[PDB]
Amino acid sequence: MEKEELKILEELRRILSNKNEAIVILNNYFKGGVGKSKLSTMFAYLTDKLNLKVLMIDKDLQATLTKDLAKTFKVELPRVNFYEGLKNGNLASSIVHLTDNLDLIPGTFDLMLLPKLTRSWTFENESRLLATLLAPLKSDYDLIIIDTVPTPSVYTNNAIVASDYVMIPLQAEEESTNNIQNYISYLIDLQEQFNPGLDMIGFVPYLVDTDSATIKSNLEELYKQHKEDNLVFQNIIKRSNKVSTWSKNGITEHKGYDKKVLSMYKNVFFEMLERIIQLENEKE
Amino acid sequence: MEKEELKILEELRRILSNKNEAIVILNNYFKGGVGKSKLSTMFAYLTDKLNLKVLMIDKDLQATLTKDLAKTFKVELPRVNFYEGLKNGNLASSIVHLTDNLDLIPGTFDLMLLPKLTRSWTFENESRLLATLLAPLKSDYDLIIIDTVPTPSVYTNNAIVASDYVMIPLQAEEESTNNIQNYISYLIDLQEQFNPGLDMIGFVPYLVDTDSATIKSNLEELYKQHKEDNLVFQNIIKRSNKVSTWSKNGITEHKGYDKKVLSMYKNVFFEMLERIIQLENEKE
Ligand SMILES: Nc1ncnc2c1ncn2[C@@H]1O[C@H](COP(=O)(O)OP(=O)(O)OP(O)(O)=S)[C@@H](O)[C@H]1O
Ligand SMILES: Nc1ncnc2c1ncn2[C@@H]1O[C@H](COP(=O)(O)OP(=O)(O)OP(O)(O)=S)[C@@H](O)[C@H]1O
Ligand SMILES: [Mg+2]
Ligand SMILES: [Mg+2]
């Protein structure tokens, strides 16, 4: 499994043993179609292979992650759906078991009822709801990985307030400095009010065309912009036909290019862990 | 232009002459990828051909409609973007002119700042913002057509409160009775509080596979369910490779299948007008 990857996992497990509860990671950005749900699926898959105990959370009406995971894993309907769990103030009956390692709180269209549920609440109580209900679950997991909508909403606010770390997938050529700074301002707003320890892991570039001069050049410029803070991931995600195959048939390892495309996701995953480890080692 | 279509347009213009201001139409549903933005583009295109004076409103951070329209029309940047117009309490400087008939308020990523802007406002003042700023513009247009996000949010609430009629595109096989009723409950909530005259035009089926037994059968069942209220459109939208061509190159009429795919959109458009006319003829 490579020595360096083994060392990263040992270090993760050591940090988790010090923390004594899960680290919560959010994949988020306000553009659709940049691979947030796909990264989430591939992280679920990889963590299960690595025997990490993980809770995936699909906080999207569309339930994209849930339906995608169901291509590879047996995904049951939960006794109580995510929206009803939130309404009941307990998420315990909303968890399904994909493997002995991998759990999921599935998405449901009933999440559309959430903003009405919380309409009369204080902004604080609305925004802290997910965090409050995740708190008792964290001792049961190594990682909790949240996927949600791209539109600023009750969903995004809950996800951000519940998380320790945020991964930001984006297409460099589609974003401007202003876009990124505005998005970061949104995170800062919620961090200061409700979640001061929130950290950005970094930006995860998505490259839809490997033979595009403008795509290459915009990516170069993003790296330049973030030379000092080092926020741009060194390992990136490239569009692959293989992902389309896995989205139809389920994820496999025994076919041509399966292991090569898997290593692309693995390299992002491990870079994410490295970045988390560095931040955790710095921490209080 | 066919006699029956000419009669529908005369009747529209007669109704608009009685109203003395634009009718506002919203394409909305809480599932992504069902052709809301595409229908909006095709309605912009068709109305321009018919010399109807139309304001398109792209209330989406992703600006999908805006970028799509820019394939066919010259789309300038507005002096003041949509978010800043909302913040300034005037949308007049946020309008661009695509043709002598067709105007657009373009989408902008800066719309992400809206929920923070309105955070301290009453739910009423937050929800009525778009309607309030559209009011002075309506005398200048025959139709105002709004496209927005699929996620329940400040955006959806503003769009719904501003509109006279809602068109609901969906894939029948992807929805359940519960989904539709829950969505309709959301409309009802805002209708009762802020917009009692709001009418649903109907459901516009999107068929992604013409050779699918389950897709056909789910569509049949939806029609059965709505036998009495007649809410399901008789004219539907089918997936077409041509739409992919127009999305890359712009809309054309001089190529193979151009006019056939255009008539598909035209038939939905005219059915929409028929349905609006029937409701208007009933009205106060
Ligand atoms: N590396 C990849 N190669 C090829 N296809 C991909 C890749 N990553 C994602 N996709 C596909 O692109 C589409 C969008 O990816 P998602 O992960 O669903 O995006 P998202 O960022 O979650 O979008 P939302 O939730 O609308 S903001 C899906 O059909 C994926 O299967
Ligand atoms: N009839 C059609 N045939 C082929 N492609 C289509 C058709 N209608 C839409 N599309 C394409 O399908 C994709 C989704 O359509 P949109 O109109 O963007 O969906 P939407 O309902 O606006 O989605 P959101 O805003 O994420 S909820 C786009 O790439 C369109 O170009
Ligand atoms: Mg997603
Ligand atoms: Mg759209």
- Ligand 2 pocket, residue B210 CB under 6 Å: no
**Which 95-124 residues of chain A touch chain B by CB within 8 A?**
109-110, 112-116, 119, 123
- The sign of the torsion formed by the CA atoms of B233, B238, B244, B246 equals negative
Give residue B162's identity as a one-letter amino acid code: A
CB neighbour list of residue A118: distance below 8 Å, 6 or more residues apart: A125, A126, A129, A154
d(CA B65, ligand 4 centre) in Å: 7
Q: Where are the domains of chain A?
A: 1-284
Instruction: Tell me which chain A residue has its CA closest to the CA of residue B116.
Output: A186
Contacts of A214 (CB under 8 A, 6+ apart): A173
Experimental method of this PDB entry: X-ray
Instruction: Show the tokens assigned to A94.
Output: 């909303």
Please judge whether A32 and B62 are an interchain contact, meaning their C-beta atoms are less than 8 angstroms apart: yes
- The nearest alpha carbon in chain B to A179 belongs to B109
To what resolution in angstroms was this structure determined? 1.8
The answer to whether B248 contacts chain A (CB < 8 Å) is no
CA-nearest residue for atom 11, ligand 1, is A35
The answer to whether B149 contacts chain A (CB < 8 Å) is yes
Closest residue in chain A to residue B29, using alpha carbons only: A112
Residues of B in contact with A176 (CB under 8 A): 109
Interhelix angle A3-19/A258-282, rounded to 10 degrees, is: 40
- A152 inside 8 A of chain B by CB: yes
Task: Specify the amino acid at residue A173.
Answer: E
Distances (CA, A) of B4 to A181, A264, B49, B263, B281: 53, 58, 17, 14, 17
What CATH number belongs to A1-284? 3.40.50.300
Task: Identify the bridge partners of residue B232 per DSSP, sorted by sequence position.
Answer: B203
Name which of B143, B155, B162 is nearest B104 in CA terms: B143
CA distance B179 to chain A (A): 7
CB within 8 Å: A151 and B61: yes
Q: What is the largest CA-CA distance in chain B?
A: 54
Measured from the CB, is residue A239 less than 6 Å from ligand 1? Answer: yes
CA atoms within 13 A on the CB side of A253: 6
